[PDB]
Ligand binder design. Structure first.
Ligand SMILES: [Mg+2]
Ligand SMILES: [Mg+2]
Ligand SMILES: [Mg+2]
Ligand SMILES: [Mg+2]
Ligand SMILES: [Mg+2]
Ligand SMILES: [Mg+2]
Ligand SMILES: [Mg+2]
Ligand SMILES: [Mg+2]
Ligand SMILES: [Mg+2]
Ligand SMILES: [Mg+2]
Ligand SMILES: [Mg+2]
Ligand SMILES: [Mg+2]
Ligand SMILES: [Mg+2]
Ligand SMILES: [Mg+2]
Ligand SMILES: [Mg+2]
Ligand SMILES: [Mg+2]
Ligand SMILES: [Mg+2]
Ligand SMILES: [Mg+2]
Ligand SMILES: [Mg+2]
Ligand SMILES: [Mg+2]
Ligand SMILES: [Mg+2]
Ligand SMILES: [Mg+2]
Ligand SMILES: [Mg+2]
Ligand SMILES: [Mg+2]
Ligand SMILES: [Mg+2]
Ligand SMILES: [Mg+2]
Ligand SMILES: [Mg+2]
Ligand SMILES: [Mg+2]
Ligand SMILES: [Mg+2]
Ligand SMILES: [Mg+2]
Ligand SMILES: [Mg+2]
Ligand SMILES: [Mg+2]
Ligand SMILES: [Mg+2]
Ligand SMILES: [Mg+2]
Ligand SMILES: [Mg+2]
Ligand SMILES: [Mg+2]
Ligand SMILES: [Mg+2]
Ligand SMILES: [Mg+2]
Ligand SMILES: [Mg+2]
Ligand SMILES: [Mg+2]
Ligand SMILES: [Mg+2]
Ligand SMILES: [Mg+2]
Ligand SMILES: [Mg+2]
Ligand SMILES: [Mg+2]
Ligand SMILES: [Mg+2]
Ligand SMILES: [Mg+2]
Ligand SMILES: [Mg+2]
Ligand SMILES: [Mg+2]
Ligand SMILES: [Mg+2]
Ligand SMILES: [Mg+2]
Ligand SMILES: [Mg+2]
Ligand SMILES: [Mg+2]
Ligand SMILES: [Mg+2]
Ligand SMILES: [Mg+2]
Ligand SMILES: [Mg+2]
Ligand SMILES: [Mg+2]
Ligand SMILES: [Mg+2]
Ligand SMILES: [Mg+2]
Ligand SMILES: [Mg+2]
Ligand SMILES: [Mg+2]
Ligand SMILES: [Mg+2]
Ligand SMILES: [Mg+2]
Ligand SMILES: [Mg+2]
Ligand SMILES: [Mg+2]
Ligand SMILES: [Mg+2]
Ligand SMILES: [Mg+2]
Ligand SMILES: [Mg+2]
Ligand SMILES: [Mg+2]
Ligand SMILES: [Mg+2]
Ligand SMILES: [Mg+2]
Ligand SMILES: [Mg+2]
Ligand SMILES: [Mg+2]
Ligand SMILES: [Mg+2]
Ligand SMILES: [Mg+2]
Ligand SMILES: [Mg+2]
Ligand SMILES: [Mg+2]
Ligand SMILES: [Mg+2]
Ligand SMILES: [Mg+2]
Ligand SMILES: [Mg+2]
Ligand SMILES: [Mg+2]
Ligand SMILES: [Mg+2]
Ligand SMILES: [Mg+2]
Ligand SMILES: [Mg+2]
Ligand SMILES: [Mg+2]
Ligand SMILES: [Mg+2]
Ligand SMILES: [Mg+2]
Ligand SMILES: [Mg+2]
Ligand SMILES: [Mg+2]
Ligand SMILES: [Mg+2]
Ligand SMILES: [Mg+2]
Ligand SMILES: [Mg+2]
Ligand SMILES: [Mg+2]
Ligand SMILES: [Mg+2]
Ligand SMILES: [Mg+2]
Ligand SMILES: [Mg+2]
Ligand SMILES: [Mg+2]
Ligand SMILES: [Mg+2]
Ligand SMILES: [Mg+2]
Ligand SMILES: [Mg+2]
Ligand SMILES: [Mg+2]
Ligand SMILES: [Mg+2]
Ligand SMILES: [Mg+2]
Ligand SMILES: [Mg+2]
Ligand SMILES: [Mg+2]
Ligand SMILES: [Mg+2]
Ligand SMILES: [Mg+2]
Ligand SMILES: [Mg+2]
Ligand SMILES: [Mg+2]
Ligand SMILES: [Mg+2]
Ligand SMILES: [Mg+2]
Ligand SMILES: [Mg+2]
Ligand SMILES: [Mg+2]
Ligand SMILES: [Mg+2]
Ligand SMILES: [Mg+2]
Ligand SMILES: [Mg+2]
Ligand SMILES: [Mg+2]
Ligand SMILES: [Mg+2]
Ligand SMILES: [Mg+2]
Ligand SMILES: [Mg+2]
Ligand SMILES: [Mg+2]
Ligand SMILES: [Mg+2]
Ligand SMILES: [Mg+2]
Ligand SMILES: [Mg+2]
Ligand SMILES: [Mg+2]
Ligand SMILES: [Mg+2]
Lengths: 61, 103, 44, 77, 94
RNA sequence: AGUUGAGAAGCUUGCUGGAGGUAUCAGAAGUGCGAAUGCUGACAUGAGUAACGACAAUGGGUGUGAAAAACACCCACGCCGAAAGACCAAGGGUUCCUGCGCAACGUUAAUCGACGCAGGGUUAGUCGGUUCCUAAGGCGAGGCUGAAAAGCGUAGUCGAU
RNA sequence: AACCCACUCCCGUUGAAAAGGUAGGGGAUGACUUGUGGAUCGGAGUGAAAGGCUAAUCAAGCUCGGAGAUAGCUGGUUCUC
RNA sequence: GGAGUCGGCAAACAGACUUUGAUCCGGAGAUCUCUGAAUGGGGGAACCCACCUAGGAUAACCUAGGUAUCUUGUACUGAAUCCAUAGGUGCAAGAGGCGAACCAGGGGAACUGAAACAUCUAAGUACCCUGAGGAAAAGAAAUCAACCGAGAUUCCCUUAGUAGUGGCGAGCGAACGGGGAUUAGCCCUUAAGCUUCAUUGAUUUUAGCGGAACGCUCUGGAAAGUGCGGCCAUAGUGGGUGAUAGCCCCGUACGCGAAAGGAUCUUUGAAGUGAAAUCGAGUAGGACGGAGCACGAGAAACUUUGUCUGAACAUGGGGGGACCAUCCUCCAAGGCUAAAUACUACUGACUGACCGAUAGUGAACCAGUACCGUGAGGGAAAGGCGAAAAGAACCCCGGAG
């Protein structure tokens, strides 16, 4: 999820993009603790997409 | 750029395998290369029953210094040096002897 | 036999603590002197 | 402190010398008293801590001129 | 609490023999929770995220273990534990 | 090891070692140790000698194990019992429990351990704090005092035993 | 008796202990003993007064500076002819 | 820029990233928990408890802003007391803390030397405290000279260990006059200069790019070494590559470079400041007690001031080492001013008749650490396999040691 397409969205659209990412991060942590997390690279990937949405959100001001 | 890239045809100068022709497989940090088919060793691997299993005697290539190989000029069949031709808009690598680009 | 060191965590902090040193300007000289030498603890 | 409030005199240091010419440190202090000065414009008494030399200056220049200087350098008189 | 706070308080299930025994005979589920979470926000997050009825939450702080190594003395992170009691009959699945 | 000078010393070689050395004549010195109850490290003598920390006390059987006086269980015997039994506070900080271990630690051995590795374990409206109140005392807006730093103190607000 | 103390003997003196132990001893409702918190300190404090005590240190604590104080005094001072 | 990458001790197992340009390097942004000047109130630093405004939820809150103290200016309000003052609230602007040294001030020892010791010395040193700056301070003659003249301040070399001073002991110690570094003055009938903006050009700094010329032979595990012949040079005693390399690699001489920040010098426009209003009065001079002048009361001039006094107005006043006369030379009690000078905690480059692990920093290594002490504080030991882990598969004794 590059920033260029994030800037193509509205403020209301970006908040639900943000909110749906936090749900995905929760599922990965729940799945990590139980033990059925095969792809461990997904944990850090979702963190930087959350940081990317918050950056573009702040740029909107 | 760097004069020796991955998957280049080279020839070995200096060392036990001086004169052998190979192809670059891996470029390491602190200017070392792994060239296919040269500088072979045998590592004796202890197969500990714990932590799964292992092997016996494995075969692999040991890295050698980057300045111990030379680009191979497949027109004169000799080793050569490379310079960087002035970029029209693109950097290219040329043979010093004949000024042809390397391919 | 009673020995000289009788521990007490409350009395230790009120005499040698960080806020006790910061109260007076002579205590603040101690802290800057320990920062200059590179002490890891700096206070007890 | 022991500082005159119109001239700025403060304590200064020096020596006592005996007959055998031994020296010990000493201080010289200004001769300062409390005095209420009548201010004609405001119809009130202003109380200052001044040296006897400061009262000589007030007599020469008046209290209005001196009080202006004290306000000029911001002194809580 | 805002909608971002619900996703950050629960860290995951706690797996142990004590935790397993409580899930069967008492309908009591052990979770790892954020170290600044409180009983009230733990209760709401479980209800929202798992869609169940929770009756009571008890919480305890756990000190990290200190391990001596060749290069000094290091210690592990402190964490917080929650015992979560559900309604008489219902389960907490994922 | 041999050999050469009056001496400090020089030279030539066998073995070891595996990458540096410096003829000659000049220049410059952190330039030469046996002592300083010298300083640092290593190792002797004493000597396989003293000691092994309350004179409550131990004896068999069985098991495990490479190995049992010391570990576990059983049958007996001894000791404390206004403690050598339980519980709060202070102080300590994982020493608590369970698997796997025995090099070092344990004044002996150790299969055992407050020892090593890895997991687990502490659940409060009523218990103890926090929150409310103040004592001795501390700090202290303004203030008064003082070469400066600062001292004392009012309103106030901290401080449990 | 507990508790506070420390009169005698012996042991111990490289100690179980840088001041103890066993056996005897004194006070034990008071000028008592004790927990927690607080105040006073270096020519200064405190002292029912021994120049005692102020972190195993006291006829002037410890620490860092002046500082490599000064030492007509001890000790040592390294290859050859 | 141009192909590898997910930092190190410190390896393995995994999961991935990508020439549609990754990792990496530089400029500008965003986020930036708690403590700490710590600043909403407390507190045993990294903790506890709040209030107000706006917005959002319905339960037991969320989000974003505010709330220390002092100084300066401003608005309102207002005691004894009529007036108006002290005081009380609200706004703005500033400060506060840290830092090795250098600078200007306030306070200020002793050991020691004098072969004892008081005056004296050490020394206005150590130390403590307060302010400022990139430098600071001082600076434009009420100055020296000597009847000839010089021309603000600061720093260096001499005069000279001289004249002086000194229980005339131990010791302290100038000036005049010369040679240099730097070059500069301008105002109170309102100036040079300096700040902050806005503009005119140039130069640098924060990253990078290109960068010449070697083959054969012997020994050897391995040539850069032997022998033989070449080539490059504004690049020839650099580093390291399996032993000693101008021509193998990275470099070097020499040439190019910057979307965007920083800084310096430069034009010309504004605002401010300089600034004290009008040439200087409780001032010059004097008496007593001290300090400073190399000068310790000495024939002791000159500066300064704790106490007490106290002028003249250019036909007037200061100085020329007691004091008088005559001459000479300056115009104090109001300001601003660069350069030459001091220092380096910090950053880069280069260099060394410096050290090479008991040396050099206490510290080559996870060091102000371990350890010691209640604390302030004190304070260690400890580097090297090999070119390359190729770091010893497998068998046997032994407790699966
Ligand atoms: Mg500090
Ligand atoms: Mg004296
Ligand atoms: Mg708890
Ligand atoms: Mg609790
Ligand atoms: Mg030899
Ligand atoms: Mg060498
Ligand atoms: Mg030589
Ligand atoms: Mg030496
Ligand atoms: Mg030496
Ligand atoms: Mg020597
Ligand atoms: Mg000797
Ligand atoms: Mg010796
Ligand atoms: Mg000798
Ligand atoms: Mg001896
Ligand atoms: Mg000695
Ligand atoms: Mg010796
Ligand atoms: Mg020694
Ligand atoms: Mg022996
Ligand atoms: Mg014997
Ligand atoms: Mg015997
Ligand atoms: Mg014996
Ligand atoms: Mg014994
Ligand atoms: Mg038995
Ligand atoms: Mg026994
Ligand atoms: Mg009894
Ligand atoms: Mg018992
Ligand atoms: Mg008991
Ligand atoms: Mg505790
Ligand atoms: Mg302990
Ligand atoms: Mg442990
Ligand atoms: Mg345990
Ligand atoms: Mg146990
Ligand atoms: Mg076991
Ligand atoms: Mg054994
Ligand atoms: Mg042992
Ligand atoms: Mg043993
Ligand atoms: Mg024992
Ligand atoms: Mg254990
Ligand atoms: Mg009070
Ligand atoms: Mg006070
Ligand atoms: Mg105050
Ligand atoms: Mg209170
Ligand atoms: Mg209480
Ligand atoms: Mg007694
Ligand atoms: Mg007896
Ligand atoms: Mg007794
Ligand atoms: Mg009694
Ligand atoms: Mg009574
Ligand atoms: Mg009584
Ligand atoms: Mg009595
Ligand atoms: Mg009491
Ligand atoms: Mg106390
Ligand atoms: Mg005190
Ligand atoms: Mg003293
Ligand atoms: Mg006394
Ligand atoms: Mg007495
Ligand atoms: Mg006394
Ligand atoms: Mg006596
Ligand atoms: Mg102690
Ligand atoms: Mg002590
Ligand atoms: Mg003592
Ligand atoms: Mg004395
Ligand atoms: Mg001295
Ligand atoms: Mg000495
Ligand atoms: Mg002596
Ligand atoms: Mg003699
Ligand atoms: Mg002797
Ligand atoms: Mg000696
Ligand atoms: Mg704060
Ligand atoms: Mg505060
Ligand atoms: Mg504020
Ligand atoms: Mg606060
Ligand atoms: Mg007012
Ligand atoms: Mg400041
Ligand atoms: Mg500084
Ligand atoms: Mg001064
Ligand atoms: Mg000064
Ligand atoms: Mg002075
Ligand atoms: Mg003296
Ligand atoms: Mg003397
Ligand atoms: Mg003498
Ligand atoms: Mg004497
Ligand atoms: Mg004397
Ligand atoms: Mg005398
Ligand atoms: Mg003196
Ligand atoms: Mg001074
Ligand atoms: Mg400053
Ligand atoms: Mg300035
Ligand atoms: Mg500054
Ligand atoms: Mg500045
Ligand atoms: Mg300058
Ligand atoms: Mg100046
Ligand atoms: Mg000036
Ligand atoms: Mg003339
Ligand atoms: Mg001039
Ligand atoms: Mg004399
Ligand atoms: Mg002169
Ligand atoms: Mg001159
Ligand atoms: Mg750059
Ligand atoms: Mg290049
Ligand atoms: Mg090149
Ligand atoms: Mg270049
Ligand atoms: Mg070289
Ligand atoms: Mg070698
Ligand atoms: Mg080379
Ligand atoms: Mg070659
Ligand atoms: Mg004038
Ligand atoms: Mg005068
Ligand atoms: Mg006088
Ligand atoms: Mg005099
Ligand atoms: Mg005399
Ligand atoms: Mg005169
Ligand atoms: Mg006068
Ligand atoms: Mg005069
Ligand atoms: Mg005249
Ligand atoms: Mg004369
Ligand atoms: Mg003169
Ligand atoms: Mg002037
Ligand atoms: Mg200077
Ligand atoms: Mg410099
Ligand atoms: Mg060595
Ligand atoms: Mg060292
Ligand atoms: Mg050392
Ligand atoms: Mg300690
Ligand atoms: Mg300690």
């Amino acid at each position: 999820m590059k920033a260029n397409e994030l800037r193509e969205k509205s403020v209301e659209q970006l908040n639900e993009q943000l909110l749906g990412l936090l749900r995905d991060q929760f599922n990965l942590r729940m799945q990590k603790a139980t033990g059925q997390l095969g792809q461990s690279h997904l944990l850090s990937q979702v963190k930087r997409d959350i940081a990317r949405v918050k950056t573009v959100l702040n740029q909107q001001a | 750029m760097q004069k020796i890239r991955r998957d280049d045809e080279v020839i070995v100068i200096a060392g036990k395998d001086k004169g052998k022709r190979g192809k670059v497989l891996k470029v390491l940090a602190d200017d070392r290369l792994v060239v296919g088919g040269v500088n072979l060793i045998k590592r004796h691997t202890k197969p500990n029953p714990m932590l799964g299993q292992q092997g016996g005697i494995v075969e692999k290539e040991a890295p050698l210094h980057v300045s111990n190989v030379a680009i191979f000029n497949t027109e004169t069949s000799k080793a050569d040096r490379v310079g960087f031709k002035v970029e029209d808009g693109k950097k290219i690598r040329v043979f010093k002897s004949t000024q042809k680009p390397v391919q | 036999m009673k020995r000289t060191f009788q521990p007490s965590t409350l009395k230790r902090a009120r005499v040698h603590g960080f806020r006790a040193r910061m109260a007076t300007k002579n205590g603040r000289q101690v802290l800057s002197r320990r920062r200059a030498k590179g002490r890891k603890r700096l206070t007890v | 402190s022991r500082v005159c409030q119109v001239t700025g005199k403060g304590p200064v240091t020096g020596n006592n010398i005996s007959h055998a010419h031994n020296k010990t440190r000493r201080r010289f202090l200004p001769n300062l008293q409390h005095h209420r000065f009548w201010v004609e414009s405001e119809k009130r008494f202003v109380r200052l801590r001044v040296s006897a030399k400061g009262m000589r200056i007030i007599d020469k220049r008046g209290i209005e001129a001196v009080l202006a200087d004290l306000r000029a350098r911001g002194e809580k008189f | 609490m805002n909608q971002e706070r619900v996703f950050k308080v629960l860290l995951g299930p706690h797996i142990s023999e004590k935790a397993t025994g409580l899930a069967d005979g008492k309908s009591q589920f052990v979770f790892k929770v954020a170290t600044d979470a409180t009983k009230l926000e733990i209760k709401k997050a479980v209800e929202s995220l798992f869609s169940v009825k929770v009756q009571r939450v008890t919480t305890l702080n756990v000190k990290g273990k200190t391990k001596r190594t060749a290069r000094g003395l290091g210690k592990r992170n402190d964490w917080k534990k929650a015992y979560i009691a559900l309604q008489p009959g219902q389960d907490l699945d994922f």
